[PDB]
Amino acid sequence: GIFGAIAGFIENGWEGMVDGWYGFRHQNSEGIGQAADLKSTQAAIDQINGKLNRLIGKTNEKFHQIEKEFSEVEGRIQDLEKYVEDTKIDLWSYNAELLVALENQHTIDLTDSEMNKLFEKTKKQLRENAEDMGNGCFKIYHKCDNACIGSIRNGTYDHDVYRDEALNNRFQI
């Protein structure tokens, strides 16, 4: 949420995108299409897997400890045994609560960050040939067929090829 893309300037997500977490939809003279972006998808996945690697399958071995249940009333020593255990459990319970809250805030933020980074990268690539419509969409001011859209998604788009055409379309009356 802190970057402002997911649940922000992108109005909603796409339930029909099932082969990636981030990607591109377009409309041009040949149709309307969708493609996932693998680099951004993998960047978010790698970070989340990094968190999981630090939490799953990581337990601590303990053997003989203290007694934690008691059949008879005893007073001072038993009060201390019970208090040590209750103290420990409350501290671990706090750690668990805070860990999940912090990690989840961070996951929401890092996923929003990856959406924003992809948007910014695309904006810069288009140079003077497009304008940002404010909703995560760019209006591209030149004929941009399927191979042209592909070049944008693959990072091989040469803005100079189309610049004269685009400037003419943008700065007309």
């Binding site: 992108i10 071995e61 419509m133």
Partner: protein, 317 residues
């Protein structure tokens, strides 16, 4: 005409609610549970060496109650004590019971070595109807009830050196008779006095004659004591009556052994984490099954669920 190019992200129809720093309920595309909250209900017999106590407490297996003869010299990683267990020998108590139980549990062995104590002058191998072994009157297998020989109980002053490279654990006891007459019938003189010592330590116990409520028709009691003897030290037993003598020593080891109270069945399966409710998987970092654990276990917490987001915010169409 030109073109439109839109950047976006996925969403799912079935999102999951998680907590964050700023919101107690936010929907994400996917999450994973971090608290283990279930067991199958069986204690897996692998990979830890499990010893099911069945009818026997550890202390009854130690002393040698007749239901526990099968336990002699056994070792364990985890001794499992059942709530149904009961004593069926001479009525006894252990001052500091909890500590003896703990130290034997932690040692992880009932390995016992007989020794030849010089009990010249008294009758050995005293038995009772409160401790039946094969219909015959019997007694604790690891203890030796000494009585008068021909109406004499001469003072005992018996020694046993530790010439081993390890520590020895001796278990012994004092008999408290129910009446002044019983004192005489057993030991031929007025109430004794026991002193068990080493170069490093000393314990003296006074028998206290008197009626206790009957258990298996016995108003007398035995009180159990223990002594650890280091290498090159010497056990000295000094008594004029009422001694329940050791027959030898237990080895005392150090390691990862313990004891647990549970009524869970032992299963033929493999699990690293044991609780009294049964073994639990240990993939998750936390668990709310039981504060009592043994092995590689998730840490006990009060929460029954903690969901870790594994996807972005879910923003459905």
């Amino acid at each position: 005409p030109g073109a439109t190019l839109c950047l976006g992200h996925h969403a799912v129809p079935n999102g999951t609610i998680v907590k964050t720093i700023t919101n107690d309920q936010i929907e994400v595309t996917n999450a994973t549970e971090l608290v283990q909250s279930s067991s199958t209900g069986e204690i897996c017999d692998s990979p830890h060496q499990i010893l099911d106590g069945e009818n026997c407490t550890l202390i009854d297996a130690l002393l040698g109650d007749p239901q526990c003869d099968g336990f002699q010299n056994k070792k364990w990683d985890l001794f499992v004590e059942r709530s149904k267990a009961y004593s069926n020998c001479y009525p006894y108590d252990v001052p500091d019971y909890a500590s003896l139980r703990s130290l034997v549990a932690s040692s992880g062995t009932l390995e016992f070595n007989n020794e030849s104590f010089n009990w010249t002058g008294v009758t050995q191998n005293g038995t009772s109807s409160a401790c039946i072994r094969r219909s015959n009157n019997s007694f604790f297998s690891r203890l030796n009830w000494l009585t008068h020989l021909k109406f004499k109980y001469p003072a005992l002053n018996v020694t046993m050196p530790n010439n081993e490279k390890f520590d020895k654990l001796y278990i012994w006891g004092v008999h408290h008779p129910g009446t002044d007459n019983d004192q005489i019938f057993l030991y031929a003189q007025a109430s004794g006095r026991i002193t068990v010592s080493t170069k490093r330590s000393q314990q003296t116990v006074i028998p206290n004659i008197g009626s206790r409520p009957r258990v298996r028709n016995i108003p007398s009691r035995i009180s159990i004591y223990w002594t650890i003897v280091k290498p090159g030290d010497i056990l000295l037993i000094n008594s004029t009556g009422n001694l329940i003598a050791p027959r030898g020593y237990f080895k005392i080891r150090s390691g990862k052994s313990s004891i647990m109270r549970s009524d869970a069945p032992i299963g033929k399966c493999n699990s690293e984490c044991i609780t009294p409710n049964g073994s639990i998987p240990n993939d998750k970092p936390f668990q709310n099954v039981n504060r009592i654990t043994y092995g590689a276990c998730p840490r006990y917490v009060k929460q029954n669920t903690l969901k870790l987001a594994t996807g972005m915010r879910n923003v459905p169409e």
